[PDB]
């Protein structure tokens, strides 16, 4: 099979925390694949404590470093055909939805395309038009935006709907570790230049959930999905059916009410210590991602964390749930 694959990635301080003059706790060493935590008191002598993970990012990696490492090998694996899922994992405030949407630079210094600031979604989506348009391709790409605050569902792309209309999920009949959703719309983008007006009335519908329900980018759980159908005309004449699904997941903050998050931690706990019975059906967003854990989906978890001592507590554990969640098998 493939254990999920699971890489650590460390925020820079910000301004104010410069200001501070603080002192970074953490110490990344990508080679060694490594992350040490200064635990104790003292900085000349010190008890740290270290974890090993299948990559390890620091401080100074930017948008485009995530990009060549992690993102185009997965991407390429769903051009290939296959299912994957990246999940962001971390207390808020360390980069989850900086590393999975990204931001804009500052004073319209660039357009979206060449913003060094773009994260995974809009580098995903203009890469794969980039790519299959130079190669011979019948392809098509369809993307959702579902999200879940308190175990309701919401639809954050529909420029129709609007977003305090819940959803509803069901088992599908055809599908064994898959659901139906009512109402959840798939919007195609045509080319790559329909792709950033599609993400402008996500960012619209964003600002009224917030508006509508208490601490809306804390708690909820997203999960952006890009689906590619290709049927590859290259220069033969050859053409063979293929599917690749691509789910990008910013969970909620992990930081010590959210049965979604508590039964994610129950599933990874049970899959790891391989009980026979996984608790996938005791929350809507284990449900819909099923089959990313330990099922046939190539999943990998991108956890975040801060340099900061403040954050000492979250970022052990932060560390340690990532750390177990290298034991999950999926095929
Ligand atoms: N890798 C990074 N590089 C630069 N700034 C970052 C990074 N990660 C986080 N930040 C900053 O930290 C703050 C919180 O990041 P955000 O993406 O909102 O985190 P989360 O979604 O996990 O709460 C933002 O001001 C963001 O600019
Ligand atoms: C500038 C505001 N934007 C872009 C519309 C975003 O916040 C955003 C994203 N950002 C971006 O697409 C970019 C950042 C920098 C260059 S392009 S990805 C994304 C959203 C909102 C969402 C609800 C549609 C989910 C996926
Ligand atoms: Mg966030």
Redesign the pocket.
Same mark, same amino acid.
């Given at each position: 099979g493939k254990n999920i694959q699971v890489v650590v990635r460390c925020r820079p301080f910000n301004l104010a925390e410069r200001k501070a003059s603080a002192h970074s706790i953490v110490e990344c060493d990508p080679v060694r694949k490594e992350v040490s935590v200064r635990t104790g008191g003292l900085a000349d002598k010190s008890s740290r404590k270290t974890y090993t993970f299948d990559m390890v990012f620091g401080a100074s990696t930017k948008q485009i470093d995530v990009y060549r490492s992690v993102v185009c090998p997965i991407l390429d694996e769903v051009i290939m055909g296959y299912n994957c899922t990246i999940f962001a994992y971390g207390q808020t405030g360390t980069g989850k939805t900086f590393t999975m949407?990204?931001? #804009?630079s500052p004073n319209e210094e660039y357009t979206?395309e060449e913003?060094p =600031?773009?994260?995974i979604?809009?580098r995903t989506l203009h890469q794969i038009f980039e790519k299959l348009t130079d190669n011979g391709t019948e392809f098509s790409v369809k993307v959702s $935006?579902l999200e879940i605050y308190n175990e309701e569902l919401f639809d $954050? =792309?529909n420029p129709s709907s609007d977003v305090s209309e819940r959803l509803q999920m069901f088992d599908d009949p055809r599908n064994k570790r898959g659901v139906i959703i009512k109402g959840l719309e798939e919007i195609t983008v045509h080319n790559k230049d329909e792709v950033?007006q599609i $993400?402008?009335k996500?960012?619209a519908? #964003?600002t009224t959930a917030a508006t509508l329900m208490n601490a809306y980018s804390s708690r909820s759980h997203?999960v952006?999905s890009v689906t590619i159908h290709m049927k590859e005309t290259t220069i033969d004449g050859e053409e063979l059916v293929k599917i690749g699904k691509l789910n990008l997941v910013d969970l909620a903050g992990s930081e010590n009410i959210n049965q979604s998050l508590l039964t994610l931690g129950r599933v990874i706990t049970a899959l790891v210590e391989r009980t026979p019975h996984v608790p996938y059906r005791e929350s809507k967003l284990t449900r819909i991602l099923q089959d990313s854990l330990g099922g046939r989906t190539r999943t990998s978890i991108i956890a975040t964390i801060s340099p900061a001592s403040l954050n000492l507590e979250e970022t052990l554990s932060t560390l340690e749930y990532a750390h177990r969640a290298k034991n999950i098998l999926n095929k």
């Open positions: 949407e990204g931001e #804009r979206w913003d =600031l773009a994260g979604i809009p $935006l $954050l =792309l950033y $993400l402008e996500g960012a519908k #964003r997203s952006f």
